[PDB]
Amino acid sequence: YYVDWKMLRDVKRRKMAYEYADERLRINSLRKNTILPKDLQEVADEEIASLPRDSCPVRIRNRCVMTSRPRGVKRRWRLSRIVFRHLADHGQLSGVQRAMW
Amino acid sequence: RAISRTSEDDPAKHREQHEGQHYNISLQELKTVFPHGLPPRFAMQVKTFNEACLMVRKPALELLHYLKNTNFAHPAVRYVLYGEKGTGKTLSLCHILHFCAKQNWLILHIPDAHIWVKNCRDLLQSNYNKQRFDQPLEASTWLKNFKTANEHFLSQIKVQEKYVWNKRESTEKGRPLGEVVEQGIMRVRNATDAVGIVLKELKRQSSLGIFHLLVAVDGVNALWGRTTLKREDKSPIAPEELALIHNLRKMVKNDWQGGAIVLTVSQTGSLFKPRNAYLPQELLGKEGFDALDPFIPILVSNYNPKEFESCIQYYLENNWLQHEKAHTEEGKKELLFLSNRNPGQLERLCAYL
Amino acid sequence: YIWENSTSEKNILETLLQIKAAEKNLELSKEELLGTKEVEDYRKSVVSLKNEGDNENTLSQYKESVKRLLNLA
Amino acid sequence: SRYGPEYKDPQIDKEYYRKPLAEQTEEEKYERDFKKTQLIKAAPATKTSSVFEDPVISKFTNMMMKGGNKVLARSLMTQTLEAVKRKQFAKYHAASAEEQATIERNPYTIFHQALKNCEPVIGLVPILKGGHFYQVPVPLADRRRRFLAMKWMIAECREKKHRRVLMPEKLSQELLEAFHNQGPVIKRKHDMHKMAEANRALAHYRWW
RNA sequence: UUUUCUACAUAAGAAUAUCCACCACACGAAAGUUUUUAUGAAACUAAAAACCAAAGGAGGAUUUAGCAGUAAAUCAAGAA
Ligand SMILES: Nc1ncnc2c1ncn2[C@@H]1O[C@H](COP(=O)(O)OP(=O)(O)OP(=O)(O)O)[C@@H](O)[C@H]1O
Ligand SMILES: Nc1nc2c(ncn2[C@@H]2O[C@H](COP(=O)(O)OP(=O)(O)O)[C@@H](O)[C@H]2O)c(=O)[nH]1
Ligand SMILES: [Mg+2]
Ligand SMILES: [Mg+2]
Ligand SMILES: [Mg+2]
Ligand SMILES: [Mg+2]
Ligand SMILES: [Mg+2]
Ligand SMILES: [Mg+2]
Ligand SMILES: [Mg+2]
Ligand SMILES: [Mg+2]
């Protein structure tokens, strides 16, 4: 069990994106180039939009891996701001100290 | 104890031992010799002092010596003045200008060529050539200044050509050139074309023995650099598009006889040039330096210790330095250090101490 | 910068023939004028000036070449 | 304040050090200045040992500054002294024999004298008593009077000048006006005296 | 007006709410219309240009901040 239903949805979304990552890249190349005929580009737009909705990189949401907080998450540690302080204040993170200057 | 104004005023007999000496020039003399733009810092100084004085500089003496040996049979000789900002390059040119006026020479003096390049309110397309522009406001002002510079030559010169202004008025051959410039002043639309006609007529007739032609152009680097002025599309125009620059460009290429041109490359009015750059090559660029060889690059320097004392003593004679302690040697040392014995910086300091 | 087939070279030819015509000297040849020692001094000065760049001595060398080429002292 | 209580204000006047042998008490003062090993603050950027500076000019220059443009404020103060000098020089030329040796051509003398005529002699401070405010005159200190004169100069030439007329020339005109005791600043000084004299019976309210 | 524009680091040129026989004009659109670019499956989001030039002419009772490299002015990067 993931910590929340929202976290489970993200795992399905990331998994679907990985499967269709290469196929989307090949089709999206045709659209983003102006040297191909406009007739072919219109057909490509139909095919790229016919792919499943969840297979979109923009729909991927970055959460915390511990508490699944949708925002306030540092990208480096992939942790929420509350959990990061909880680990750092106890000295359980290497090289992290209270800033004084 | 310094000698400031004891030297007798004569541009012809100025010798080397008279270095760092001020010679008086009459106020009415400035009116008939400098109708164009005198430098604003110097023009303000003479108005307050009510006395016009100029110090004999080494570059002025060096250029004076070459002028006395000029051979009018030989083609034109190009002299250029270069140096750092505030060294009195314009006043050195004005010293040459007064000398040639005293010898009754034909004067073509340009106060600042940058004015004809930047900040033009009116941009009228030309008629002689469709792909060229006109600057009536700048051209008309120069003609009025040139008209008052000399009057004897404006009537002595006879125009031998066929010139048509419009379908209603025209000027035929035999008319004095003074009537042509007066037509250009009254008719501002064709004033720019009048400037080209005046320039080309003098150049063609300069080969005769009736002329002692001197052309003074200040800011020659503006004849080849890029121009700020744009067009209806707000696109920059080349410096060759302007008719005034294009015709004046023909006045510096060494092909005519019986004349000499004194040039000066400056930085104060330059466009797209850095503050520190003062040497002739970078100011002119590749194209500017290419169409100017050969020349004599006379260098203008700062004050020497002898000159510095003379300038300070000159102000004390006019009671300009009004500070209580400015009369002591300690004040003189501070002026030397702060101004770096540079004439331009010294004038700014003395204006408020 | 190469001296051969240059715009500065064209100016020198025009500058020298005018003096020769003014002095009424009927000798006119490309080899004669371009083989002069003074022109060789001019060639060295211009090439050095455009390549090395502006300098106090470089301009001083340029002054000497022009003064001797124009018979001005 | 990065300076501790031990640090003191440096002495800049060079003449104070070059001729100490003509006095005894002052010699004891500065010989103990370093014998006590008292630390000295760094020299401020504005003040300098140049003989051409003046303390009243620096204070006036600082107040003219808006934001952080010391260059612009110094530039304006340079032109104003020049502008005053130009006007006095022109007036000297167009004068008779007796009028010639009357006009002052020293802007520093004019500037110092102008401010000494714009300083009020007695100010006003509100005092609350009985639920109402009474304007009670007080003998303003010398520093306040000197500062108040400078503020009036700046306030006048910033507000009621025209948009076309430049700042350096407008301030130059008022300095000459104050030098002759006829400027609007002098009028404002008299107006403060009018109110102080009117409330001359309320001076008993103040308790110092 | 200690202002605006351009060149450029700070010594320059030019403009400047007014005159008018007609004109046309200063400061100030960040807004809005149109076009284009960037991201993205999707532009409704952001940015650039052209056109456009409105309120605003130092703000009522009252009120906030700062003791020195501080206030204020100006520039830059980073987090997501
Ligand atoms: N020969 C001189 N005699 C007296 N005063 C001089 C002389 N030369 C220069 N000055 C003073 O120095 C000022 C600078 O002169 P000028 O404007 O000619 O300088 P410039 O070097 O040509 O400047 P820029 O860099 O603007 O081209 C003059 O206004 C004058 O006050
Ligand atoms: N209005 C007018 N101007 C003329 C006429 N002829 C010559 N000019 C002017 O004289 C100047 C010299 O032109 P020019 O150098 O001979 O032209 P180019 O041969 O193309 O370089 C030009 O700027 C013209 O404006 C004419 O018939 N009418
Ligand atoms: Mg839960
Ligand atoms: Mg798209
Ligand atoms: Mg997202
Ligand atoms: Mg100059
Ligand atoms: Mg300016
Ligand atoms: Mg505007
Ligand atoms: Mg605007
Ligand atoms: Mg907008």
Side-chain angles (χ1 to χ4, degrees):
Chain A
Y1 294 109
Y2 291 95
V3 73
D4 197 359
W5 286 100
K6 325 294 172 55
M7 202 174 186
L8 174 58
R9 251 181 286 175
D10 199 81
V11 180
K12 303 177 181 298
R13 193 165 293 102
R14 292 178 180 266
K15 180 188 303 178
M16 230 70 61
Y18 188 87
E19 294 187 359
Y20 292 98
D22 51 70
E23 293 182 3
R24 160 164 279 95
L25 175 60
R26 300 168 184 172
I27 302 177
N28 194 19
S29 60
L30 311 176
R31 308 172 66 258
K32 299 300 181 180
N33 201 337
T34 187
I35 58 187
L36 283 181
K38 300 179 181 179
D39 297 332
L40 188 62
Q41 300 175 187
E42 296 291 339
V43 184
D45 294 355
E46 176 267 353
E47 184 177 354
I48 188 62
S50 65
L51 300 185
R53 299 287 302 276
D54 289 358
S55 61
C56 289
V58 294
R59 293 170 68 95
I60 304 298
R61 185 58 173 178
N62 294 334
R63 301 171 170 264
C64 174
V65 301
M66 299 296 180
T67 52
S68 175
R69 204 173 187 273
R71 46 176 56 93
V73 177
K74 305 304 295 296
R75 180 179 254 269
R76 185 169 186 173
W77 295 273
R78 313 179 199 173
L79 294 182
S80 173
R81 85 161 197 269
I82 303 101
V83 179
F84 182 89
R85 289 194 55 195
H86 183 269
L87 270 60
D89 288 327
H90 291 239
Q92 304 188 9
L93 257 55
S94 65
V96 182
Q97 67 187 61
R98 310 279 286 204
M100 294 174 55
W101 82 94
Chain B
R1 309 176 186 179
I3 303 302
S4 303
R5 305 184 61 179
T6 317
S7 63
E8 306 183 18
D9 43 354
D10 184 14
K13 66 179 181 59
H14 281 150
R15 289 164 292 271
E16 286 73 15
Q17 71 278 4
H18 299 349
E19 188 72 15
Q21 297 295 338
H22 307 75
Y23 73 100
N24 183 24
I25 171 176
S26 179
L27 174 59
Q28 302 295 334
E29 190 71 18
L30 302 177
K31 206 172 186 299
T32 177
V33 176
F34 308 102
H36 292 68
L38 203 64
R41 299 308 303 182
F42 186 78
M44 188 176 183
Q45 180 181 8
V46 54
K47 172 61 183 300
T48 297
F49 284 154
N50 198 23
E51 299 181 353
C53 298
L54 182 56
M55 191 173 58
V56 180
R57 297 295 302 274
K58 271 192 172 182
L61 289 176
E62 180 183 359
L63 189 47
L64 240 57
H65 175 256
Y66 301 155
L67 259 299
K68 298 179 181 298
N69 307 338
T70 46
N71 184 19
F72 302 97
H74 294 171
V77 188
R78 292 200 277 257
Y79 308 90
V80 295
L81 300 176
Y82 74 101
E84 51 176 348
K85 187 170 187 178
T87 38
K89 299 181 303 303
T90 310
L91 286 191
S92 297
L93 175 62
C94 295
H95 187 79
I96 311 300
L97 206 70
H98 177 247
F99 161 78
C100 295
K102 192 66 177 182
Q103 303 294 334
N104 199 20
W105 285 46
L106 185 53
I107 301 300
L108 289 181
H109 176 257
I110 307 303
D112 276 322
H114 307 279
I115 305 179
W116 298 358
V117 186
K118 62 186 178 183
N119 296 327
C120 287
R121 182 179 180 269
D122 294 326
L123 193 60
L124 304 182
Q125 199 168 186
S126 178
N127 299 273
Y128 184 83
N129 183 86
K130 290 191 175 182
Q131 308 173 189
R132 277 218 290 264
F133 300 91
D134 295 349
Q135 307 176 223
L137 293 183
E138 292 77 6
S140 179
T141 308
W142 181 77
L143 293 177
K144 295 176 55 60
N145 298 322
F146 175 63
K147 172 61 183 61
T148 57
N150 35 21
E151 298 177 358
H152 289 60
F153 291 89
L154 268 298
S155 65
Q156 183 186 30
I157 296 165
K158 297 302 178 181
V159 179
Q160 321 87 8
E161 262 308 319
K162 187 61 180 64
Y163 297 145
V164 179
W165 305 114
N166 296 320
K167 67 173 185 177
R168 299 185 177 185
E169 69 279 3
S170 62
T171 302
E172 295 181 350
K173 58 183 59 181
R175 304 286 81 186
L177 202 142
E179 297 178 356
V180 184
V181 55
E182 288 178 357
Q183 202 281 336
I185 295 179
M186 299 176 57
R187 192 70 62 179
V188 295
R189 176 183 174 270
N190 300 339
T192 62
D193 297 332
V195 174
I197 281 183
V198 168
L199 262 54
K200 67 174 302 179
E201 191 70 20
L202 295 183
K203 174 183 178 180
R204 182 176 63 182
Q205 303 178 3
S206 298
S207 60
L208 307 181
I210 201 180
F211 284 156
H212 295 297
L213 180 61
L214 177 86
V215 181
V217 182
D218 198 0
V220 194
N221 47 12
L223 302 180
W224 292 269
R226 203 161 65 261
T227 295
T228 303
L229 294 175
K230 298 178 178 299
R231 58 183 59 179
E232 57 178 347
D233 195 69
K234 295 184 180 180
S235 63
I237 64 178
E240 312 309 315
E241 306 291 339
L242 302 179
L244 283 75
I245 299 183
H246 182 73
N247 302 14
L248 182 57
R249 165 183 296 260
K250 302 179 180 180
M251 202 55 57
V252 297
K253 43 187 62 179
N254 196 348
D255 54 354
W256 76 101
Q257 314 298 301
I261 54 186
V262 181
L263 299 182
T264 294
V265 281
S266 181
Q267 176 52 225
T268 306
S270 297
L271 298 181
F272 306 96
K273 295 300 178 181
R275 164 67 158 82
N276 63 325
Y278 71 99
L279 303 166
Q281 182 177 358
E282 58 257 33
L283 296 181
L284 294 175
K286 171 64 66 61
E287 183 179 357
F289 179 82
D290 180 62
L292 207 62
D293 300 352
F295 52 83
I296 304 181
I298 299 179
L299 167 59
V300 184
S301 305
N302 283 321
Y303 282 177
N304 50 77
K306 172 60 191 302
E307 277 181 340
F308 193 95
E309 300 294 333
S310 300
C311 181
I312 294 301
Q313 291 294 338
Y314 171 81
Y315 287 160
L316 268 60
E317 295 170 4
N318 295 267
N319 303 122
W320 188 244
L321 274 62
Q322 286 298 330
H323 203 290
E324 188 273 343
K325 210 175 183 180
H327 297 351
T328 60
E329 181 61 31
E330 290 78 7
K332 295 182 178 59
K333 298 198 192 72
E334 294 189 358
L335 286 179
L336 190 146
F337 189 87
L338 285 179
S339 60
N340 192 28
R341 59 190 187 269
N342 177 272
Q345 294 284 356
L346 189 145
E347 184 268 354
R348 296 298 176 91
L349 263 68
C350 296
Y352 73 100
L353 71 92
Chain C
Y1 177 78
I2 48 177
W3 171 257
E4 304 84 4
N5 201 329
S6 306
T7 311
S8 299
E9 179 178 352
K10 293 183 178 59
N11 303 333
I12 292 304
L13 267 63
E14 179 64 28
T15 311
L16 293 181
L17 64 87
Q18 283 286 351
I19 299 178
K20 264 63 179 182
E23 296 179 4
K24 288 296 178 296
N25 298 335
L26 302 186
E27 50 275 13
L28 296 172
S29 298
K30 272 68 59 182
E31 180 69 17
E32 175 190 358
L33 276 308
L34 296 177
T36 317
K37 174 62 64 178
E38 306 291 344
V39 178
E40 180 63 27
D41 292 325
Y42 185 84
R43 178 202 304 178
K44 299 178 181 180
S45 183
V46 173
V47 171
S48 179
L49 191 147
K50 282 196 174 183
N51 292 16
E52 184 179 8
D54 300 331
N55 196 20
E56 192 274 342
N57 51 14
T58 298
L59 293 180
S60 300
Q61 180 180 0
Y62 194 85
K63 290 175 60 64
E64 305 295 336
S65 174
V66 177
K67 285 177 183 57
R68 305 306 301 114
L69 190 60
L70 272 303
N71 301 334
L72 301 181
Chain D
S1 57
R2 300 300 292 263
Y3 291 102
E6 287 78 8
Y7 290 81
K8 307 193 311 303
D9 201 314
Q11 175 71 204
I12 318 178
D13 290 331
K14 177 176 58 181
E15 295 183 353
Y16 172 70
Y17 297 86
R18 297 312 180 95
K19 45 184 62 59
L21 300 179
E23 213 279 343
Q24 187 274 342
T25 67
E26 295 184 356
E27 273 183 347
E28 187 187 2
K29 302 173 185 178
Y30 76 89
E31 72 191 7
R32 299 172 303 178
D33 199 1
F34 70 97
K35 191 176 184 178
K36 295 170 185 177
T37 69
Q38 301 196 54
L39 300 168
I40 303 300
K41 297 182 179 181
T46 297
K47 305 194 62 177
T48 322
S49 178
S50 179
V51 301
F52 291 151
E53 77 163 13
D54 211 78
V56 74
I57 302 299
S58 296
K59 273 296 181 180
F60 191 79
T61 311
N62 290 8
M63 301 184 189
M64 298 236 305
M65 175 181 56
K66 294 180 59 181
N69 288 14
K70 192 66 174 301
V71 180
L72 189 59
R74 181 59 174 175
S75 177
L76 261 56
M77 191 60 182
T78 288
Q79 301 180 17
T80 299
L81 296 188
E82 171 189 353
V84 170
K85 210 167 197 176
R86 301 292 184 179
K87 298 181 182 301
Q88 292 300 93
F89 263 94
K91 197 175 185 178
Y92 179 87
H93 178 59
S96 299
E98 72 287 350
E99 302 175 358
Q100 276 174 0
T102 305
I103 302 183
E104 188 74 12
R105 288 90 58 85
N106 182 274
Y108 294 92
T109 302
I110 298 181
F111 189 90
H112 292 57
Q113 183 62 26
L115 295 187
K116 288 189 177 183
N117 293 328
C118 303
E119 47 179 0
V121 188
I122 176 171
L124 302 175
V125 52
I127 295 183
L128 180 61
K129 185 173 60 61
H132 312 294
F133 289 92
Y134 298 83
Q135 306 295 325
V136 178
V138 280
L140 293 184
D142 301 1
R143 56 177 193 273
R144 175 63 184 183
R145 301 182 302 104
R146 188 182 302 102
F147 162 72
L148 192 49
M150 301 179 185
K151 185 178 179 299
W152 287 348
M153 274 296 184
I154 303 300
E156 183 214 12
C157 62
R158 281 183 176 177
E159 296 294 336
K160 68 173 198 177
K161 77 169 183 179
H162 196 38
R163 36 184 292 271
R164 283 301 193 98
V165 51
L166 278 308
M167 174 65 169
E169 53 190 17
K170 180 53 188 292
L171 204 154
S172 64
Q173 299 177 356
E174 299 300 328
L175 291 185
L176 276 309
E177 294 282 346
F179 186 71
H180 300 304
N181 304 266
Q182 59 174 351
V185 182
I186 306 298
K187 193 263 184 181
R188 185 172 179 178
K189 165 190 173 184
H190 294 339
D191 292 3
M192 199 173 189
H193 292 3
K194 295 290 191 301
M195 192 65 58
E197 193 275 343
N199 304 333
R200 71 178 179 275
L202 296 184
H204 296 157
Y205 283 3
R206 67 186 182 96
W207 49 85
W208 62 88

